[PDB]
Amino acid sequence: MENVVSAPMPGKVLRVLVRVGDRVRVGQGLLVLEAMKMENEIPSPRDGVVKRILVKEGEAVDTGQPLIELG
Ligand code: NA
């Protein structure tokens, strides 16, 4: 899915760091997944604007699951 940031591993959503409409830059933390016994910031792969937030706190996600859509 183009413009979609997806989960790199299974985990639990701890918090979302951005809001719809936010400008983001490559490497910027978009949300935090608990996995591999740690808290992991999931980065933006590119500069952009946050278009949609596709998960909520507490949600269990799988590898490749859409997390954030960029505009
Ligand atoms: Na799930």
Residue numbers in the entry: 79 to 149
Give verbatim excerpts from the published study on this entry.
This domain adopts a flattened β-barrel comprising two homologous ‘hammerhead’ structures that confer an intramolecular pseudo-twofold symmetry reflecting the gene duplication. In this work, we used the C-terminal 70-residue fragment of PhBCCP (PhBCCPΔN79) as the template to prevent the N-terminal heterogeneity that was observed in PhBCCPΔN76. Moderate deviations of up to 2.53 Å were observed at residues 114–116, which constitute a flexible β-turn harbouring the Lys115 residue to be biotinylated.
The wild-type protein produced an orthorhombic crystal form belonging to space group P212121. The structure was determined at a resolution of 1.8 Å, which was intermediate in quality when compared with those of other structures. Residue 138 is located at the perimeter of a crystal-packing interface. The wild-type crystal packing is rich in indirect polar interactions mediated by water molecules and a sodium ion, as observed in many other protein crystals. The numbers of nonpolar interactions normalized by the total buried ASA for the three crystal forms were calculated as 0.108 Å−2 for the wild type, 0.099 Å−2 for the A138I mutant and 0.135 Å−2 for the A138Y mutant. In all three crystal forms the crystallographic asymmetric unit contained a PhBCCPΔN79 monomer, although the modes of crystal packing mutually differed.
